[PDB]
Every structure is written in C-alpha cells, then in structure tokens.
C-alpha cells in the first residue's frame, strides 16, 4: 500500500514534507514536473490523470490513498470519477478551488475535501478590520509555531473507557482544549457533557507539545 | 475608507462575497480580469501592482486595507514593499504560496499573512489515515455548515468586564467554546484560568448561530 | 423557451443548420468564438460554462434544452453537473470524446450522449477491407443524400391505434424500413411481430422523402 | 499489406482498438504523440503528412489502406492529394470535419469518408425534442450494447445463390433486419423484392450476436 | 468587378503597389492583418479563406480575379478548391511554396501559379560560383531598373498583321528582344522564323522604356 | 571550401537539391530545424546567426559561399554584417523580403540579392489581366520544363575569341537566345551588334537542352 | 524640432522624465505600449519601426533627435538604417545591447551609442572584489546623490577665453574636477596643461550643485 | 570559493569576460539558458533562484559573491532576500531595472546595485542636444578604448603612506585623474587637499594604461 498524487502544486509539495520516507507516485502530464517531483524524493509517473488507463498505470487500485489536485475543478472531478470506476474502496483526498464544486467533488466520490481558496478568501474579508481568527488559523493550522491540533485515539482498554466528558475533565487535567470526538466518519464538535467515550474514539483538540504529551499518557491504562 | 485588491484569484473572488456593496478597487495588469471583476460588482484599476505609480493610481494611501494576492510570492512581496513606501499605516493582508516566504511577507510589511497551500498540503498528508482535523477545518472554516468561528468584542461597560475566565463560565453559559482572546495585535489562545477581561477585548470561539446570539446578549446592557 | 449551447465546435455549428431561425444562445469563454457565433445568426454569451453563476447567466433554467460540447470530457462533465444543480428537469444533450466517458456523461445527468469520435474510429478500422457499413453511415446518417432516418409519432386517433406490427405491414405499405418503436425513454429495436401500437409511440425508420410522406398519411385521421 | 495512419486523434486511437495485432504506421509531426502511439503498439514515423517525401517514408506505397485524420480539412485534403501522387490504388479512408469539404475529400481521392462532426451536429439538433434516433446510433454504431451492424458475404456455392429477396425471407428466418446489399462499390439500400442474390454480394444488416450467427449458417454449405 | 486577395504576405503588399487605385478586398482571419491592409488603402474582410461561406462573403463570384497566398500550401489549395466551387470562371492567381504543389495548385483550379521559393532556392545554389542569371532576375524581374519585360498586344488592323517573325525584324527595328508570343492560353517561347503574327497575339519580350514605346508605335494604326 | 547557410526556409531546402552531396552547414537557433536539416543530408550548427561568435563557430571565414535567409530583413542584414566583419572577401548570397531593404543588404555587404517576394508581388498584379510573363517565369525560371537560362563561359582560345556579336550570329547557329554577356562584375544585357567576345566572358541566355549543348560545342576547341 | 523615440523600455521611459514638456513621438509595434506612453504624456504612433513608411509616419524627417532602443540590435541597426534613408542630418541616439554591435550601430549611422548592458556586466565582474568604481557610477551617473556630471559651455566674451588649463586652475577655483573638453565632435579627456580655451568649448566635469554653480559664474561676463 | 549568477542576460555574459577561466555557476529556470551558458565556458545549475532550496543547491553559502539579474525587479528582490536568509555575509551584486527599486534592492540586502536602464535613459535625454557626457560614458565606462576607470590599493609600506593629496601630486606625477578614495565601504569623491593616505585605501582614477602602470609603481616598496 502506497500513495498516489494526481497533479502538482505547492500544496502537493507541502504534502511531501510528511510523506518523504514513504513511496509516493506523482501522476502528471507535464514533463517539467519530472524535475520537481524528483527534487522532493518522490516517484514520477508520466500520464494524463483524467484518463482511466493512466490512473491504473500508477497503481491506483490497492493504493493506500489518492490525493487529487489538478489545475481546474473540472479536471479534479473527472479524475476522481476515474478512480471510483477503478476502485471504490481507496481513500480519496481532493482539493477544491471553487466553492460551487465542494459538493461535486464529494458526489464524484472524494472521501475528504480541502477548500484552501474558500478559507483564504473568507479570512481575507473578515481580517480587514481585526482578524484575530486569521492569526489563529495562521499560527495553529499553518505554522504550528506554539500550538498544534491533534487526533489522538483512545486505545483498547483505555483509562477513559466508559468515562463521560464531564468526568474526564480533559481540558483541566491535560491542558488540551477538546474540540470534538470522532467516530467512524463522523465528528461531533463540542460533545454533549455526558457523552461516553469508547475504545476507537478520536479526540480532536488544540494544544502545545507538552499538553499533547500529557494527553497521550492520560489515555492508556 | 475603501479596499484595494492587488491581483485576482478565486481567493479574491471568494473575498468579495463579504464586501459586495462596498467600494472595492481591484488592481491588476491583465485585461481579461476587468471582465470578472465587473461580474462581481467591484471597480477595476488597470496597472502593474508592483509599480509604485500604479499603486497610487489605485488609491492605496488612506485606504481602509489592501489585500495582496499576486501570481508568485516574488510579486506579492514586491507589491507589499511598494505599498509600505506609499503608506506605512494602511492595513495589509497578503496570501503566501511557499512556506519559506511567510517570513518574507512579514518583513516586507504585511500585517496578516494567509498560507492556504501550507494548510492544504499539511491537511492532505495527515488525512491519509484519518483526518478528522481535515473535516473540522472543512465544516467550520470553509463551509460553516452548522458552526462558525466568531470575533465578538467586549463592549464598554460590559457585564463581563473585570471578570475572570473561570468566573465568566462562557462555555457553560452560552454553548460557545472559547479558543482565545485578542488584545491589541495579540491573540492569547487558551487564556489563563484567572485572566481578567477588559472592555475592547475580542472573544474568539466556535459556535452555532444561536450559541453566538446568547453570547452577544451575555456581554452588553 | 430557447436553446443553450455550451462551447463551440463544428458539431455545434452543424447543429444550427436545424435551429437557424430560433433563439440559440452560445455560452463560451473564448472571445474569438463571438465572431463565428454571430456569423451563424446566434446569440453569444461570454462566460465560463463550468461556472454555475455563468450557466444561470445564460438562462439555463427553464430553457428548451442545453447542448454541451466543450474542449474536453473533463469540462463537458463538469458543465453537465453544474446545469443539473441549476435545473434537474432541463434536457441535456452532450458530446463525449472518449469511450470511457460516455457513461460518466450519463451519470452526470445528460439525457442523451453522442460519441462521434468512437463511431468514427470504430468505423475506420472496419472499412479497411470493405465497409458498406461506412457508406451506409455516410450516405444516410451524414449526407442524407437519398434516404433518411425518421422519428414519426403515432398521434391520437391514429389509423394504427392498437394495430399489431405484422397487421400494420408498414414496410410493404409505405416503403419505410421500421427499425424500432420508441415509448417514453425506451427504444425497442426490431420489435416483436405481435407488438401493438399506441398513441404516443415513435416510429424509427429508414426511408426516401416520398416513402416518409407516405408514412405520415397512413398514420393519422 | 499494412496500415498507415496520418494524424493522431481520439478517432485514430479508437481505430487501433480493432487493429491491435497488425502492422500500423502512425505519421504525425507532433512529438508528444510518439508516447501514446508506442503504448498503443504501433510504429511511429515523425514527420509532415502533407509532404510527399514523409508520406513515402511512412510506407504509404502498397499499404493495405491509409487512414487520414489531420487537424483541419485543409491538411487532410492536401494529405490525400499527396498519397494519390505516390499510389493511386491504396484504399484511402479519410475523416471530414466540415460538411462543405466532404465533396472535396472524394475529389481529392478518398475512397470512403467519415463525417463524425456532421452526424453529431445533426443528432444534437434532432434530439432536442425526442431523439430515439440518437440512442439507436449510440447503441448500435458506438456501444454495440445489444445489437451490432453486420457485413456478411455470400460465399461461393451458397444456399441463397440465385434466390430472390422475398424468397430468401431473411428477417423472419434469422432475426436480422436487412438494410442493404453491396455489389462492387455501390450499396442498394432496401433492395427490390425480386432482387436476385449472387455469390459475392454483401449483406448489410442489424442484429444481435445470435441472429448474426444464424445468418452465417443460413448461407453456406 | 474588383480584386479579392486571400491571405497576406509581403507579396500581397507588393501586389497592391499597382492596384492601389482599385477596389481590393483582402480576406484574412488574423485581426493584426486589418491594420496593415487599411494602411495600403485596401478593404479588409474578416473571415476564414478556406471556408466557402467566408469566400462567398468576400464577393469571390463576379470578382475580376482572385489572388490566393495563404500560410501553407495545404490552405492555398483548399482555398482554390472553394473558389472553384463558387465560380468555375473566375481568374485565379496562386502562390506556390513547395515544388511538390505546383501541380496541385493547377489541379485544384489555379490559372497561374507563382513559385517564388522554388525560383529563389534554385537561384541560390546556382549563384554560388557565378550567377549572372541571378543579377538578370534581380534587375529585370524584381527592380526593373533600366529594362523590364513587356506584354504588348497586336491591335486589330496592325501593320504587323500577317507579317512573319523574320520579316517583322522586331529586335532590329525596335530594340525589344522577343522572348515569345502568346495566343489564347498558349505561349510560344522563341517563335520559329516563319511564324505569322495575328491581331490579338501578345508579344512578350525584354526592353528599355524607349524600346517599348518604339514597339507600341511600330504595330498599330 | 563548403557552403554555410544561415536560416532555413523552403528556399534553402530547394537550394540544397543542387548541392546535396556537398558539405553544407546550416546555422540556425531553432531546435525543430535540426530535424529537417538532417532530413536533407545537410549539417546542423546550433547558434544565433546574428551573433558573430556563432558565425565564426560555423566556419564562415574561408568558406566557398554563405547563403543568408533569416526570418526578417532586420536579421538578414545583421547577419551579413557579421560575416563581412569576419571576412570581407567571402561570397554572400542573400534573400530580401521587403523592397526597401534590397539596398540595405547590398550596403551591408551582400554580393548577390534575391528578392522573391518583390518578384512574386509584381507578377501578381501584372497577371490579373494577362500575364504571359507570369507563365514564362514559371516555366523557365521555376520548373525549367523544356527550356532554361544558361551561363556558358568562353574558353581560352575559343572559336569566338575576338569575334563580334553580329559575326558570331549565336542565335541562328545555336538556337539559344542571348540575354546578356558577363564580364568581371558587369552584366551587359542585350550587347551591341559590334561587342567583341573575349576568353572569360559569360554568355547568358535561354535555351533548350540541345540548343545549350550546341553552344558549348560552338565555342571551344 | 521635436523628439522621436523608437521602441519602449524602462530606458525610454526614464528618458521622458527629463523630456516631459516637449513634443515626443513614440513609435512601437506593440499595442499595449499606448496606455503607458500617454500616461507619460507623449504622442504614440502604432507601427513597425524597422519600416521606412512607418518611420516617416512618426515624423523622423527633420526631428530634433531620434532615440532608438528596440528589442534586439538586429532591429535597432535596421531601424537606424531606415532613419538614415529619411534624414541623414537628424541626431540619432541608439542603445546597444551586444558589444559586437556597438561598431554596427555607428556604421549604420547612429550619432551617439549607449551601452548599458556592457557597462553593467563590466561593473558586475569588477565589484566581486571591491567595486568602489561601481558606487561612483551609481552615485554620479545614476542617482546623482551629492554629485553629478556637467557640460557647461564657454560663452562668447568669456573670462576664460584664451586662458590656459594651468592658469585657469579650475578645480581649485570652483571644486569641479575637470574631466574633459569638447571641441566639434570630439572630447579630449585630461587635456595638456597648456591647452588654451575658446568660446564654445564645452567643459566636462564632476561636481556638487554649489561647485557647479560657481563654474557658470567663473566663465561669463 | 566561486561565483554564483542568478538569471541570464547580455549583462551576465559581459560579466564572464573577466571571470572566463574561473568557476562560475549560473542558476536559471529556463532550459534554453543551458546551451548559452555552456557556450560561455560556465557551469549551469538548473533551478528556481527565488526558491531558497534551489539557491542552497547552487552553493550560495560561502561563495565568493552572488550576482543577481533576473527577468524583473520582483524576482531580483525575492532572490536577494532568499540569499540573505541563507548567508548574510556573502557579497551580493544585483542589477536594478526600475529607479524605484534601487532603494529596495539594498533594503533586501544587496551590497552593490547597478542600474543600467536608469543610466541609459538619463544619458538619452541629456544627449539630445550635445552630450559629451554620453561619449565619456561610452568610451571610458563602456568601451575603454583609450582610457579606463581604475581601483588601485595602497599596499602596506607604500611610498604614499601618510602623505596628503596635495603633497602626493598624483595627477602631475603619473597622469591619472584622481576621482575618489575608498576606505571600508565608503568612497570620498574629490577628497580634501590635506587628506592623508593609509595602507588599505583604494584610489579611484581615470588613466591611460601607461598612466595607470605609472601609478602602480609610484605606490609601492
């Protein structure tokens, strides 16, 4: 199981910061891309990511996950549609440029959508006056200068097994703010006070390196 | 006061959903852009955002804010530098493509920096396995489908003035998670338990429309 | 109610041979297209037919039909999807370039697809030796030099109402070779001999101009 | 005896679906085309198909057939002219974009013309209202989902030799709709009832795999 | 009756030095050509000279003559074919780039071919050693600096009517070297000594302007 | 000694039909040109013909002749200027686009100018009415179908040495029309009746292959 | 007497900073240049500066001076040649890119040559080590921070008329470093100690605005 | 230690006249640059000199100097900033196009700036009338035909150590016109009469080669 990236932008370069060590195949039609992809220590596959026979050429079936990021949403959607006809199980992460098309990328079959231009534009217009939101996003989601965001799983037979959010007191015990809990494909933001934790649940929250460290300790029993 | 936009992408289009009805002047060299900018109900100024004389031609001095989003960070930086030479007061929001260049846009004189490709790429790599963080960002920062992030100010003569975060009990009172407090240019994420609120402080948090309303009530009168 | 054409090619031009006298609106982004479109006696709408806001600008909702034929299947698919989110009733006729994408075009929401490239290329390989098929296609489906394909509806109170296909004996009476009968969205090619006609049925036949005239009379009053 | 293809499009790619296994020379001047051609399993000769020296380089002389599909009818007509100047015998199959030029493709020398854009354009305009015709052509000339078009010869000493059309009663005996009969270079569509079959005639008809198979038996032995 | 020019090169600008005073319509697709064509006191028609409807648009039927000079031979031919399809009578002067195609221009329907590239290439290799031929062509066919080639008609009731070439003694009486004599469509280069002149014959030969005036006088009245 | 060719048109390719078997080097900057240049059996030198160091690179000093035919007159002139700067003796044959620049190539330092565009334009305007001149240029200077122009040298101790033009009676003895006589750098078109031939003079005239052969014999031995 | 400028660059723009107030015609091929030229307050003529007819359209004849700065030395040379055909008197100032062509620009007819790329590259290579030379040129010929270069003429009835270099002792009297002396068309840098001044001689020297001011005083009255 | 050059122009070509034989590495993104750079005897690094990772790859750290001259002031500035973030010691020589940006190039960290466009344009306006200045610049800074600009160090134990400019009398002794004295980073143009020389001072003068040679000897041992 390996990672396939369709298209190449700064996004997919930043993506290879955390996959550089894993076998990554980049599928793009432009030749000039070969140089850049090999600069990042990834495999390059020359072909058209909108063509079904070329998606297979890059082992899309049986692959760990596919990241789609082409030059228009038109191409991005069409590429997704191709993957779903090749393998309906493989995880698809795709970038959406236009807001209109977030819905389309999902209906094409993308598992998770990323809308960086929708965010950017929204953060711009809000930050005209103040935009403390903007510098939050910049410092937590972009730079992670002091704080980071974490997905921590509750392991089987955890200390928090069957413990309500109220009793768990996660924020004061560990320092991490609890944003929400994830089960399956579903995230419950700001969970009810008496929600009960299970093994396999995902805790999502903001915290510094140490507060995160305390969190991981606080969970295994 | 009016808003000047340098360059044109989907970001700046998405940006105009919120200023649509305000005096917005878009400065770009490409002729094809006039067509789209007039489609969005904004003014068009034909010039080179990197040339100082064209920046003045677009009323950058004494403008409310300038948003900089050009085709490369090279240009973005060069544009900012031109603005800082016309007016060192005017608020500058700029989007950075490469990570290495976030530091540079600040040194050039940008007030708030946005890094959509840094976020996008980082979200991509971590969402290969799970990515509940990814769908959080998607549903609150991008789509605002159920929840939203808010900046509410503490009015002069507030009910919460001189009251600590522990005493304020804002989470249990209103439903809104308090992420941080802004004073001046400084955002304090997860503020000290005994931190004292002042008039003019900005509350940054996540909430549903109703939970937001209860917060607005909870401050004034 | 009018016809909207997304994109411009020789197909969409040949299409105006039969609507030449109707309000046809052509939506395309390339400026060069205007000149050609106005030489055809057609309305031109400048815009991106993959952008929902531009499709609506072209009065796609409540139009007679939308013809989609863009530079790539990628865009053609995307366009269809956008139309389908503006109006799910409007009839969509779309041209597929690649074979793999005929079924993508239907699953996007096009009511009728055409694969001129697939027909053409398949016909090529088959005409290397003989190819009486190719000259059938050319002389009947392209030039209509002597014979034509016809769709003739069986009107209310028709002479043929409730008459069996063998009993009707249309080929020997009229001259027209009956290929199939259409009801609703379903075409029964070579219908069983004991099939009954109803008012509303469509007869699909090959025939000479006089032979077709003879059919129109044998049906009504 | 081998096949020469001048120009590269989705049509010529679809051609090699049926030619894969035989010796094909593809002549175009774009280099990008080498890649797609060798992964299609054909020989590639880089050069200008409108230039006679390059056509000769591509073994047009004494080829089984030459298929011409260039970017404009200008080039396609010029190409055919060249081929006829090298070899006036070789079967020329050429694709006409514009209607006006179908007449010219023949006058230049092409033995059979295909006009995909003309067919497509006409099917579009017709299918606005109903278009059961479109879905016939789609499901028999393109997809061959249930029915196909056949060209079966009458072999030497066949059961049907010297038998009249009415006497042969082919539709009822076999299930196949007889469209026409080919003698020499001409197709007689809907032949007279008393037409006599000869060894060497070609039957052009519509039928399913079983009906087709029944037809081949019905003639020989 | 008026002159129609397809395409635009330096040739066609030089052609206009002697029609400037007549109505000339240049038919080209390039917008840039408009500026140049109006700088010569010539009319501009915007259109595709290989498309028959654009050819008709520019009054090709009933035009005095059509000059065809397009960007490739492929086109020049296609253009000529279109003109011949509108009017089989109209005089066609066509410029030929490749030698291969001098034949094809004539078969397409050109009344006179000009092959400046062929002439030029031959003069090049020829003039490496000597090329006295080269400076003749330069000084008589290009510059006409002292001499020039003449076409002079023999008027009705001419002093030369019925006089043989020997008896007429033209070179010695007038100074004009006779190259040939034209009747109908036939050009006799170096006419035999006993060739008899007729009213309507064209004398073709080289001469200074005084030698030409001498000939004019020597034939008429 | 060898031929150096700056630039590449159909002119230069035609030029090579007569040198094919000589070491000819084509100096051009374009990569596409390599293909075509090696397709004619010529050598490719990659350089900028207007850059003197690249000019030297291609053995311009001490080369038999240099043929200049670049894409604009600005370039052609420039080139000629470098070659003259590298060597004032070397034979330069140069093609002229605009009439304005025939003077400029000669002053730049070209030995013989060819102006096919000027010739072709004049022949166009001329041939609207008649143009028997046109078909002469076509059949004698371009195609040489039955006649051609010759340059025949008078050998040392020729039978014509010291014989006058009248006494030589060349036309009547040989069949060749004499146009002019070449001495040194000077061409005397239509030489006076009493011009005395010398060993080294060049007879320039039009003739059939047999008429030319007759002349060669008539002069020597 | 007005100024014609051929071609547009930052140079010709920097030029108009000192000319704005006088009649300037700018001749350029590119349309985009119009807006920037009228923003600079000079007349713009659209046309080909390498063509005589267009140069005449731009009023080169009897202009005060013509400045030539086209995109290649090729064009600049051709351009100058054209001007010299129109007016052999007009002062031609031209900019040389390549060093090899400075000699060509003069031989073409340019009165003064400026070689900014040659000065630049030369200053780049020297300054690797020290480069106090680089900062002199920058601070005197470019920025004129504290000092600049002067050309003060010696008027009729001059105090210095007939006085020698040693006796005039110009540096000690005025602070101005005497660089050279202009007589006719020729500058004598660092003249003999006993050189005697004349009215109309031009002094070329380096100085501050006060030092320069004293020199003007020092000469007249 | 070696020299790194970012971007390529005739400036950087002229630069290699003085380092031709030294290890020069040229960093540019355009493939086409490769061939030109290797014709100059320099090394080519393929990369984007605005990307920090690519400046690193070019060994910018600890290089002798870095010369920046890119397509636009935007890119030139970005480059300098990248270098200063890699090494804040390395000497940066950069070329500025626009006047506004000379300010910026230094503020980005360039040790020495050159503005060939500013000089050139300034000289143009100045030289419309006379311009002996321009011919100083041309013949001394550009061509160096008779006289050169020089930087000579006063070595340790110099004859001139601690001698004033009045007492040194360098102009009358050696013939070189003393312009300024350089110490550290500062140039004192036209130094005071009684300025004392020190070991390590740089003398900036204008001299003939013998004049300069005479200075080198007057200065040592």
In words, what does this structure look like?
- 8 copies of one chain form a homooctamer.
- With 221 residues, chain A is an alpha/beta fold.
- Chain A folds into 3 domains: 1-115, NAD(P)-binding Rossmann-like Domain (Rossmann fold, 3-Layer(aba) Sandwich), CATH 3.40.50; 116-145, Voltage-gated potassium channel (Single alpha-helices involved in coiled-coils or other helix-helix interfaces, Up-down Bundle); 146-221, Alpha-Beta Plaits, CATH 3.30.70.
- Helices cover 36% and strands 22% of the residues of chain A.
- The first copy, chain A, contains 10 helices and 10 strands.
- In chain A, the strands form 2 sheets. Chain A has a 6-stranded parallel sheet, sandwiched between helices. Chain A has a 4-stranded antiparallel sheet with strand order 7-10-8-9.
- The longest helix of chain A has 14 residues, at 73-86.
- Chains A, B, C, D, E, F, G, H: It is found in: Cell membrane.
- Chains A, B, C, D, E, F, G, H: One of its GO terms (molecular function) is monoatomic cation transmembrane transporter activity.
Distance between the termini of chain A: 32 Å
The CATH class designation of the largest domain in chain A is: Alpha Beta
Largest interface, by Cβ-Cβ below 8 angstroms: which chains and how many residues each?
C-D, 72 and 69 residues
Shape of chain A: globular
Per DSSP, the total helix count of chain A is 10
Q: How many discrete domains of chain A?
A: 3
Strand order of the largest sheet of chain A: 3-2-1-4-5-6
**Main sheet specs of chain A:** 6 strands, parallel
Helix content of chain A: 25-40%
So, CATH architecture of the largest domain in chain A? 3-Layer(aba) Sandwich
The SSE string of chain A, one letter per element, is EHEHEHEHEHEHHEHHEEEH
- Proportion of strand residues of chain A: 15-25%
Estimated structural class of chain A:
alpha/beta
CATH H-level name of the largest domain in chain A... which superfamily? NAD(P)-binding Rossmann-like Domain
Specify Rg of chain A, calculated over alpha carbons.
20 Å
DSSP summary, beta strand count of chain A: 10
Oligomer: homooctamer
- What fold name stands as the CATH topology of the largest domain in chain A? Rossmann fold
PDB class: transport protein
Keywords: Rossmann fold, octamer, gating ring of a Calcium-gated potassium channel, transport protein
Assembly: octameric
Entry title: Crystal structure of MthK gating ring in a ligand-free form
């Amino acid at each position: 199981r390996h990672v396939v990236i369709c298209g190449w932008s700064e996004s997919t370069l930043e993506c290879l910061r955390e996959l550089r060590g894993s076998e990554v195949f980049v599928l793009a039609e432009d030749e000039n891309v070969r140089k850049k992809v090999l600069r990042s220590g990834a495999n390059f596959v020359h072909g058209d990511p909108t063509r079904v026979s070329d998606l297979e050429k890059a082992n899309v079936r049986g692959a760990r996950a596919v990241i789609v990021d082409l030059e228009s949403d038109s191409e991005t959607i069409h590429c997704i549609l191709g993957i779903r006809k090749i393998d309906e199980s493989v995880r698809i992460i795709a970038e959406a440029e236009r807001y209109e098309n977030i819905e389309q990328l999902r209906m094409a079959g993308a598992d998770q959508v990323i809308s960086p231009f929708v965010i950017s534009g929204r953060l711009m217009s809000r930050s005209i006056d103040d935009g403390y939101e903007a510098m939050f996003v910049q410092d937590v989601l972009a730079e992670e200068s002091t704080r980071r965001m974490v997905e921590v799983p509750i392991p089987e037979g955890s200390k928090l097994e069957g413990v309500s959010v109220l009793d768990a007191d996660i924020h004061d015990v560990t320092g991490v703010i609890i944003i929400g809990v994830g089960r399956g494909d579903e995230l419950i933001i700001d969970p009810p006070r008496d929600y009960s934790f299970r093994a396999g649940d995902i805790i999502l929250g903001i915290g510094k390196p140490e507060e995160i460290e305390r969190l991981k300790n606080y969970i295994s029993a």
